[PDB]
Protein backbone atom coordinates (compact mmCIF):
# COMPACT_ATOMS: atom_id res chain seq x y z
CA UNK A 1 0.00 0.00 0.00
CA UNK A 2 1.66 3.20 -1.18
CA UNK A 3 2.05 5.97 1.40
CA UNK A 4 0.35 9.39 1.05
CA UNK A 5 -0.36 10.08 -2.58
CA UNK A 6 -0.42 13.73 -1.58
CA UNK A 7 -3.21 15.59 -3.41
CA UNK A 8 -2.68 16.33 -7.05
CA UNK A 9 -0.40 13.98 -8.97
CA UNK A 10 -3.37 12.69 -10.93
CA UNK A 11 -3.12 15.05 -13.93
CA UNK A 12 0.33 13.57 -14.50
CA UNK A 13 -0.29 10.19 -12.85
CA UNK A 14 -3.23 9.22 -15.06
CA UNK A 15 -1.10 10.57 -17.91
CA UNK A 16 1.49 7.92 -17.01
CA UNK A 17 -0.98 5.34 -15.66
CA UNK A 18 -2.77 4.60 -18.95
CA UNK A 19 0.50 3.66 -20.67
CA UNK A 20 1.29 0.85 -18.21
CA UNK A 21 -2.11 -0.13 -16.79
CA UNK A 22 -3.44 -3.43 -18.13
CA UNK A 23 -6.18 -4.16 -15.59
CA UNK A 24 -7.68 -2.00 -12.83
CA UNK A 25 -9.62 -3.45 -9.90
CA UNK A 26 -11.20 -0.67 -7.84
CA UNK A 27 -12.63 -1.79 -4.50
CA UNK A 28 -15.50 0.71 -4.22
CA UNK A 29 -17.05 0.38 -0.76
CA UNK A 30 -20.64 0.52 0.45
CA UNK A 31 -21.34 2.39 3.67
CA UNK A 32 -24.70 1.47 5.26
CA UNK A 33 -24.54 -2.38 5.25
CA UNK A 34 -20.92 -2.01 6.37
CA UNK A 35 -21.90 0.01 9.45
CA UNK A 36 -24.82 -2.35 10.16
CA UNK A 37 -22.46 -5.34 10.05
CA UNK A 38 -19.85 -3.52 12.14
CA UNK A 39 -22.20 -2.63 15.00
CA UNK A 40 -23.98 -6.01 14.96
CA UNK A 41 -20.66 -7.88 14.94
CA UNK A 42 -19.33 -5.69 17.76
CA UNK A 43 -22.39 -6.61 19.84
CA UNK A 44 -21.86 -10.26 18.86
CA UNK A 45 -18.20 -10.29 19.91
CA UNK A 46 -18.81 -8.54 23.23
CA UNK A 47 -21.91 -10.65 23.99
CA UNK A 48 -19.91 -13.81 23.27
CA UNK A 49 -17.13 -12.57 25.58
CA UNK A 50 -19.57 -11.84 28.40
CA UNK A 51 -21.43 -15.14 27.91
CA UNK A 52 -18.14 -17.05 28.19
CA UNK A 53 -17.15 -15.03 31.26
CA UNK A 54 -20.57 -15.59 32.87
CA UNK A 55 -20.25 -19.34 32.36
CA UNK A 56 -16.64 -19.38 33.60
CA UNK A 57 -17.44 -17.31 36.70
CA UNK A 58 -20.50 -19.34 37.68
CA UNK A 59 -18.70 -22.66 37.24
CA UNK A 60 -15.54 -21.52 39.05
CA UNK A 61 -17.47 -20.13 42.02
CA UNK A 62 -19.84 -23.13 42.18
CA UNK A 63 -16.69 -25.28 42.33
CA UNK A 64 -14.59 -23.23 44.76
CA UNK A 65 -17.36 -22.29 47.23
CA UNK A 66 -18.17 -25.74 48.76
CA UNK A 67 -14.41 -26.20 49.29
CA UNK A 68 -14.35 -23.06 51.48
CA UNK A 69 -53.16 7.55 82.36
CA UNK A 70 -50.43 4.95 82.79
CA UNK A 71 -50.79 3.90 86.43
CA UNK A 72 -54.35 2.51 86.56
CA UNK A 73 -54.01 -1.28 86.49
CA UNK A 74 -50.68 -1.48 88.34
CA UNK A 75 -51.75 -0.43 91.84
CA UNK A 76 -54.09 -3.05 93.35
CA UNK A 77 -52.85 -6.57 92.41
CA UNK B 1 -33.93 -19.72 46.84
CA UNK B 2 -33.48 -19.46 43.07
CA UNK B 3 -37.21 -19.92 42.44
CA UNK B 4 -38.11 -16.75 44.36
CA UNK B 5 -36.00 -14.74 41.89
CA UNK B 6 -38.10 -16.15 39.04
CA UNK B 7 -41.31 -15.49 40.99
CA UNK B 8 -40.37 -11.83 41.46
CA UNK B 9 -39.25 -11.53 37.82
CA UNK B 10 -42.49 -12.96 36.44
CA UNK B 11 -44.60 -10.85 38.81
CA UNK B 12 -42.82 -7.77 37.45
CA UNK B 13 -43.27 -9.10 33.89
CA UNK B 14 -47.03 -9.45 34.40
CA UNK B 15 -47.20 -5.98 35.96
CA UNK B 16 -45.36 -4.63 32.89
CA UNK B 17 -48.18 -6.06 30.75
CA UNK B 18 -50.56 -3.80 32.71
CA UNK B 19 -50.85 -0.10 33.55
CA UNK B 20 -50.13 0.25 37.26
CA UNK B 21 -47.14 2.57 36.75
CA UNK B 22 -43.57 2.22 35.45
CA UNK B 23 -40.91 4.25 33.63
CA UNK B 24 -42.12 6.59 30.90
CA UNK B 25 -40.29 4.43 28.35
CA UNK B 26 -42.38 1.36 29.20
CA UNK B 27 -45.61 3.37 29.42
CA UNK B 28 -44.95 4.86 25.97
CA UNK B 29 -44.10 1.36 24.70
CA UNK B 30 -47.44 0.05 25.94
CA UNK B 31 -49.04 3.17 24.46
CA UNK B 32 -47.68 2.58 20.96
CA UNK B 33 -48.45 -1.14 21.24
CA UNK B 34 -52.09 -0.46 22.07
CA UNK B 35 -52.09 2.19 19.32
CA UNK B 36 -50.97 -0.45 16.80
CA UNK B 37 -53.60 -2.84 18.18
CA UNK B 38 -56.22 -0.12 17.68
CA UNK B 39 -55.04 0.62 14.14
CA UNK B 40 -54.88 -2.99 12.96
CA UNK B 41 -58.44 -3.93 13.95
CA UNK B 42 -60.90 -2.82 11.27
CA UNK B 43 -63.82 -3.04 13.72
CA UNK B 44 -61.78 -0.65 15.86
CA UNK B 45 -60.82 1.60 12.95
CA UNK B 46 -64.45 2.02 11.81
CA UNK B 47 -65.61 4.24 14.71
CA UNK B 48 -62.60 6.60 14.78
CA UNK B 49 -63.56 8.75 11.76
CA UNK B 50 -66.46 10.45 13.58
CA UNK B 51 -65.73 13.79 15.27
CA UNK B 52 -67.37 12.91 18.61
CA UNK B 53 -64.39 10.80 19.73
CA UNK B 54 -61.90 13.55 18.83
CA UNK B 55 -64.11 16.19 20.46
CA UNK B 56 -64.34 14.22 23.72
CA UNK B 57 -60.54 14.33 23.98
CA UNK B 58 -59.83 17.80 22.57
CA UNK B 59 -61.84 19.57 25.29
CA UNK B 60 -60.30 17.58 28.18
CA UNK B 61 -48.82 22.79 28.12
CA UNK B 62 -47.19 19.48 27.21
CA UNK B 63 -49.74 18.10 24.74
CA UNK B 64 -49.71 21.24 22.58
CA UNK B 65 -45.93 21.33 22.10
CA UNK B 66 -45.78 17.53 21.73
CA UNK B 67 -48.31 17.83 18.91
CA UNK B 68 -46.74 20.85 17.24
CA UNK B 69 -43.30 19.20 17.06
CA UNK B 70 -45.02 16.55 14.94
CA UNK B 71 -46.43 19.34 12.74
CA UNK B 72 -43.07 21.03 12.13
CA UNK B 73 -41.41 17.63 11.57
CA UNK B 74 -44.16 16.70 9.10
CA UNK B 75 -43.66 19.99 7.24
CA UNK B 76 -39.88 19.51 7.14
CA UNK B 77 -40.24 15.91 5.91
CA UNK B 78 -42.63 17.08 3.20
CA UNK B 79 -40.16 19.80 2.18
CA UNK B 80 -37.33 17.25 2.00
CA UNK B 81 -39.67 14.94 0.05
CA UNK B 82 -39.56 17.01 -3.17
CA UNK B 83 -36.31 18.76 -4.08
CA UNK B 84 -33.06 17.34 -5.44
CA UNK B 85 -29.82 18.00 -3.56
CA UNK B 86 -28.11 19.17 -6.75
CA UNK B 87 -30.41 21.58 -8.55
CA UNK B 88 -29.22 22.25 -12.10
CA UNK B 89 -28.96 18.87 -13.80
CA UNK B 90 -27.45 20.46 -16.91
CA UNK B 91 -24.86 22.60 -15.11
CA UNK B 92 -23.76 19.48 -13.24
CA UNK B 93 -23.09 17.98 -16.68
Amino acid sequence: IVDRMPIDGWNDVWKKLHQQIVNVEVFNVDVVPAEVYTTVATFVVWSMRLALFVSLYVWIDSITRPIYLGSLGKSRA
Amino acid sequence: QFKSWIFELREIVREIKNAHYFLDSWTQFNSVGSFIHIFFHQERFRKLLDPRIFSILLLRRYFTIKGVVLFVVAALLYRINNRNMVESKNLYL
Binding site: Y37, A41, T42, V44, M48 | -
Partner: protein, 54 residues
Protein backbone atom coordinates in the same frame (compact mmCIF):
# COMPACT_ATOMS: atom_id res chain seq x y z
CA UNK C 1 -52.55 -47.58 48.82
CA UNK C 2 -56.26 -47.08 49.55
CA UNK C 3 -57.98 -43.82 48.61
CA UNK C 4 -61.28 -42.44 47.32
CA UNK C 5 -60.04 -41.14 43.97
CA UNK C 6 -61.71 -42.46 40.79
CA UNK C 7 -59.44 -44.16 38.27
CA UNK C 8 -60.74 -41.86 35.51
CA UNK C 9 -59.41 -38.74 37.25
CA UNK C 10 -56.01 -40.14 38.29
CA UNK C 11 -54.02 -38.91 35.27
CA UNK C 12 -55.36 -35.38 35.92
CA UNK C 13 -53.33 -35.24 39.16
CA UNK C 14 -49.89 -34.99 37.49
CA UNK C 15 -47.96 -32.11 35.95
CA UNK C 16 -47.08 -32.37 32.27
CA UNK C 17 -43.67 -31.24 30.96
CA UNK C 18 -43.24 -28.36 28.52
CA UNK C 19 -40.95 -27.89 25.54
CA UNK C 20 -38.58 -24.91 25.90
CA UNK C 21 -39.16 -22.02 23.51
CA UNK C 22 -37.43 -23.23 20.37
CA UNK C 23 -36.84 -19.88 18.65
CA UNK C 24 -34.09 -17.97 20.59
CA UNK C 25 -31.39 -20.52 19.75
CA UNK C 26 -32.14 -20.22 16.03
CA UNK C 27 -32.01 -16.46 16.62
CA UNK C 28 -28.55 -16.96 18.12
CA UNK C 29 -27.53 -19.20 15.20
CA UNK C 30 -28.59 -16.60 12.63
CA UNK C 31 -26.95 -13.77 14.57
CA UNK C 32 -23.75 -15.84 14.69
CA UNK C 33 -23.63 -16.70 10.99
CA UNK C 34 -24.30 -13.04 10.19
CA UNK C 35 -21.10 -12.22 12.13
CA UNK C 36 -19.25 -15.52 11.61
CA UNK C 37 -16.10 -13.70 10.46
CA UNK C 38 -15.91 -11.83 13.77
CA UNK C 39 -16.55 -15.12 15.62
CA UNK C 40 -13.56 -16.68 13.84
CA UNK C 41 -11.39 -13.63 14.57
CA UNK C 42 -12.31 -13.67 18.26
CA UNK C 43 -11.79 -17.43 18.58
CA UNK C 44 -8.36 -17.12 16.96
CA UNK C 45 -7.39 -14.20 19.22
CA UNK C 46 -8.66 -16.22 22.20
CA UNK C 47 -6.40 -19.14 21.28
CA UNK C 48 -3.46 -16.77 20.71
CA UNK C 49 -3.96 -15.09 24.09
CA UNK C 50 -4.37 -18.45 25.85
CA UNK C 51 -1.17 -19.77 24.25
CA UNK C 52 0.65 -16.58 25.26
CA UNK C 53 -0.61 -17.12 28.82
CA UNK C 54 0.43 -20.80 28.70
Amino acid sequence: RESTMPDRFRYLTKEAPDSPIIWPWFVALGFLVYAWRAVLFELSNWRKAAFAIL
